[PDB]
Amino acid sequence: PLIVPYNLPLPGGVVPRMLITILGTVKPNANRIALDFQRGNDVAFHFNPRFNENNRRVIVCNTKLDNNWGREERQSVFPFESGKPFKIQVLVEPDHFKVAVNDAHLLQYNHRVKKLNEISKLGISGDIDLTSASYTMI
Numbered sequence: 378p379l380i381v382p383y384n385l386p387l388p389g390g391v392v393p394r395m396l397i398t399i400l401g402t403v404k405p406n407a408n409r410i411a412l413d414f415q416r417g418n419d420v421a422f423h424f425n426p427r428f429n430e431n432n433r434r435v436i437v438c439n440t441k442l443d444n445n446w447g448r449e450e451r452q453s454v455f456p457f458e459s460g461k462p463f464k465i466q467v468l469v470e471p472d473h474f475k476v477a478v479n480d481a482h483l484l485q486y487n488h489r490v491k492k493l494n495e496i497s498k499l500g501i502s503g504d505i506d507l508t509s510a511s512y513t514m515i
């Protein structure tokens with residue numbers, strides 16, 4: 378396993394056709410998971426499954442600029458389950474990040490941060506056992 382929180386460097390940032398794959402297992406009684414694609418201190422893409430927000434499960438996505446969070450985008454399709462292994466694939470496309478979980482499309486998030494080649498770290502945190510984090514150009 379990998380130690381959480383985990384930092385995955387993204388050398389030279391991201392670019393369309395870059396596929397980032399995160400493998401892990403959600404802990405029992407999980408509350409949250411976060412994948413934070415960072416441009417320095419800014420968070421270009423916060424992908425944030427929440428397991429118990431007012432007794433609902435929801436995926437929250439957002440961006441943080443100059444330490445301020447923006448307007449969330451929410452997705453109630455929720456493919457994670459406490460205790461179960463998952464695969465998150467984030468495919469950078471020209472206008473959005475495209476996310477699939479366990480080989481099923483989940484959501485897209487349009488690029489708010491434009492300097493893709495400066496989004497040079499992925500932070501992985503929350504209630505998981507992290508098995509691997511890697512990327513490949515497809």
Ligand SMILES: O=C(O)[C@H]1O[C@H](O[C@@H]2[C@H](O)[C@@H](O)[C@H](O)O[C@@H]2C(=O)O)[C@H](O)[C@@H](O)[C@H]1O
Nearest residue numbers: 411423425430437438439440446447448449
């Ligand atoms: O303080 C809040 O209102 C929230 O703080 C966390 O959420 C932050 C951020 O405020 C939010 O815009 C973003 O989408 O997700 C962030 C995060 O850390 O996940 C709490 O998670 C949230 O429940 C609110 O309390």
